[PDB]
Amino acid sequence: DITDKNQSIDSGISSLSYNRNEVLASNGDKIESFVPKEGKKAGNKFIVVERQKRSLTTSPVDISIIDSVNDRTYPGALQLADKALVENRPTILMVKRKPININIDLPGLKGENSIKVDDPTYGKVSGAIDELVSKWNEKYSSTHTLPARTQYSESMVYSKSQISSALNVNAKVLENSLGVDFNAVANNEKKVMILAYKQIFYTVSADLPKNPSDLFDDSVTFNDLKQKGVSNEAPPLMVSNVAYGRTIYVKLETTSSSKDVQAAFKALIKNTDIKNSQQYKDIYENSSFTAVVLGGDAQEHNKVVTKDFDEIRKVIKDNATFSTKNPAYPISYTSVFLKDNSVAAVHNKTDYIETTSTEYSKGKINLDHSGAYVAQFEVAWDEVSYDKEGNEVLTHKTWDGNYQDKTAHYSTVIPLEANARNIRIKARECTGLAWEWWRDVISEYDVPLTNNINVSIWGTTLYPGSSITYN
Amino acid sequence: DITDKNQSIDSGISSLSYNRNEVLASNGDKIESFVPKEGKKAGNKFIVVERQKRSLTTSPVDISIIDSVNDRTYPGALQLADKALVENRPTILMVKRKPININIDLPGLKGENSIKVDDPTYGKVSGAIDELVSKWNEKYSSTHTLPARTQYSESMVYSKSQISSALNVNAKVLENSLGVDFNAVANNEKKVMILAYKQIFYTVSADLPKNPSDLFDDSVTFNDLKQKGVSNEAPPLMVSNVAYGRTIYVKLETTSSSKDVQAAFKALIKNTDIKNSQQYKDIYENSSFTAVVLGGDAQEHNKVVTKDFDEIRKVIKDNATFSTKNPAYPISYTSVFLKDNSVAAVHNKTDYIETTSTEYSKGKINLDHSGAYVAQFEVAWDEVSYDKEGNEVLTHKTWDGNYQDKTAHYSTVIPLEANARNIRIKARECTGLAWEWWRDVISEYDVPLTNNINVSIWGTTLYPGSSITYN
């Protein structure tokens, strides 16, 4: 009852003035410079990258917990709403408290899933929760394990801020546990996909009080609260919901810049036949998969790194069971503002560059002339690039052996760069006055660029023959 | 020997001053305004068009003849080099002439393929040519038909100027004979491909004179020449080469805006197995093929319009033979400047917009819930468009039945627009406290948009089941 006139925990709390939708919000990198299209050579390949700008907005109410077995979050706790909470390390507030009622959502306990906790402390609520679970176990004595409520998330990685908001996890967890090379992703040197299998055993909620005072023992004053950190930019909160279980995170990673990485990946998780295709097996040959289990009942820093996804499938399969007789730890939670008793949400807004690539490979044209006549060739093609504007630039090339007599068995190779386009191969027999009035033995336009383009000409002057194959 | 001091056909001609590389050149539409990317709905489809600017340069020396049997072009004729010549209707010059030597390139007549033509007139050179051909026929009396020297050209159509320079034909011939809808092509309402099978029977050349005077009878004065049209922008020329035969033009046309039209077309001409694929047969169902034969031995305005390419194959096959006993007509020719006796070339330069499209089709999501439990869905997706800058704009949509209990057998359809993207379908069983802590029964992201997306959920509360199929 300071010289402040806010001297009733209720008025002290009610007279707080804050924007509930702006106190817990965080806007990630808001950024602006890039090239729309790009052509890059790397080894025996040509990568074409395209960039769009995208924007993601989120307002999760379910907040991810970092240190599962050290995070002393419990239903009915008091926290401050600020940047610390948003950084997954909220400030707790301890004071003498009035009892609180807790409820667990396990199935088949309707009507007997509540318990009053006189002294609401991490340890004393944990015991109450344990009581509740024992009750369920007493009722269903021969059911020692239940399926976990799995929630599946999936997404490609483009930026630290994009993927965190997308999966609703601290970026540190992905960078540290799965080890995500955000710079490789940025330079499109690696394409990464991240899966998240959230395994919820059950959740426990605390009955919302109709007045902030009902939570606090009467010896606690609004002063003690401000002293503890309550203010306009640090509004008081109560944990109303806590989810218990564990999470399986998976990273699929490749050096392929192929337009089919996401589908190839997708095919592998689903185990659809398409995964046996060869454009996919090639990508799989240059991919690696990592799986880590975080949360309850997992020895910290466990990890699996493989090239055989079946090992990943095993980790997903093995960690979806909930043993009702073994301890469980908080995995996430939701909070309510003490003021209007409304659910607290963390607002995130962030732009990011979305990249889509295509991978081209070097190839060669193989000419074979076994025809009983003199012939001349004309081989031409363009080499594509992209100016700063992302616009195409074509540079015309031609085989130095064009328009030159070739007789009974000639063999050559005309290597092509991975960025070769508008490829045309022509061969004319030499009966007539000149090139312009000579018979076509083979005439191809827009020959698709592959590993090997095999052109062969044979036959007689009267009846030449020819074919073009690919590899 | 006017008051002009140019009084010797040789000096009169030698004192002419002109740019040989600029007198016969024509620059087609040089143009500048367009949108890089565009999204267009048409029926139950969404067409995405992309535009690049391209530039084509040509310098043909072989000049296409328009009216095969009315074109009195003959080896050893005199023409003016100007815009008329470039318009495929050159100005001829007649005067008393000194003899000229002609040579035909038919095989097996080496040493006896020449003849002197005392009075070089269309009719008198035509007879000499006929003499030469009779000589060949006398030598090879039992060979009445020979294969024609076929020259194959192929190209997609983008603009009147682009296709003319590409195929080296008068645009009128394609617009008039094949009937090309250049406005439909422009609005990408029709995709057209044009083939050209030039059938050369033989060519006849005239020996170049070492002096302009040697061509002219001595009674002809430089005055008569100027009077006839010779000038600095109308330099004198002699026809040095004439090709005889006919040409088969083919048009492949479709209303499909599919990214596979060119490959589908290509597959059909080659008759490669890929043509039996279904993405190709669909395109073929919306295509039409036209074939016309121009030139010698064809009744004017003949034409074939079909949906069965085998009919086209027949016209190509049937018109490749050269009957040595039947008359032949000029199909093209080359000219030499009288000044430096150099080969005349028509220089063309033209820009054009190259368009590449992709066709998307409408689809629907089919939900079937036959599970022994209450479930809730979450269906969301974006609808893409493109701003004036060609940039993507995403508009988020959601099924109005999201987050609402659905029980023992529910069925629904969620139609999607052909521009639907980032499609996600989720279903959760309702055991728990709320949506956020409910078990996933199905969770898909980036579901490819097809005709039918069939999602079905069943099973028990403990063990739900689900699947997603496509059509």
Curated annotation (Swiss-Prot), chains A, B:
GO terms for biological process: killing of cells of another organism. Its main location: secreted. The chain crosses the membrane at residues 160-173, 180-189, 258-267, 275-287. SUPFAM superfamilies: Perfringolysin. The keyword Transferase does not apply. Pfam families: Thiol_cytolys_C (PF17440), Thiol_cytolysin (PF01289). One of its GO terms (cellular component) is extracellular region. Gene3D superfamilies: 3.30.1040.20, Perfringolysin, Perfringolysin, domain 4, Thiol-activated cytolysin superfamily/Thiol-activated cytolysin, alpha-beta domain. InterPro entries: Thiol_cytolys_C (IPR035390), Thiol_cytolys_C_sf (IPR038700), Thiol_cytolysin (IPR001869), Thiol_cytolysin_ab_sf (IPR036363), Thiol_cytolysin_sf (IPR036359). It is found in: Secreted; Host cell membrane. Keywords: Cytolysis, Hemolysis, Host cell membrane, Host membrane, Lipid-binding, Membrane, Secreted, Signal, Toxin, Transmembrane, Transmembrane beta strand, Virulence. It is a multi-pass membrane protein. PROSITE patterns: THIOL_CYTOLYSINS (PS00481). A motif (Conserved undecapeptide) lies at residues 429-439. One of its GO terms (molecular function) is toxin activity. A motif (Cholesterol binding) lies at residues 461-462. Homooligomeric pore complex of 35 to 50 subunits; when inserted in the host membrane. Belongs to the cholesterol-dependent cytolysin family. A cholesterol-dependent toxin that causes cytolysis by forming pores in cholesterol containing host membranes. After binding to target membranes, the protein assembles into a pre-pore complex. A conformation change leads to insertion in the host membrane and formation of an oligomeric pore complex. Cholesterol is required for binding to host cell membranes, membrane insertion and pore formation; cholesterol binding is mediated by a Thr-Leu pair in the C-terminus. Can be reversibly inactivated by oxidation. This is Perfringolysin O. The lineage of its organism: Bacteria, Bacillati, Bacillota, Clostridia, Eubacteriales. The gene is pfo.
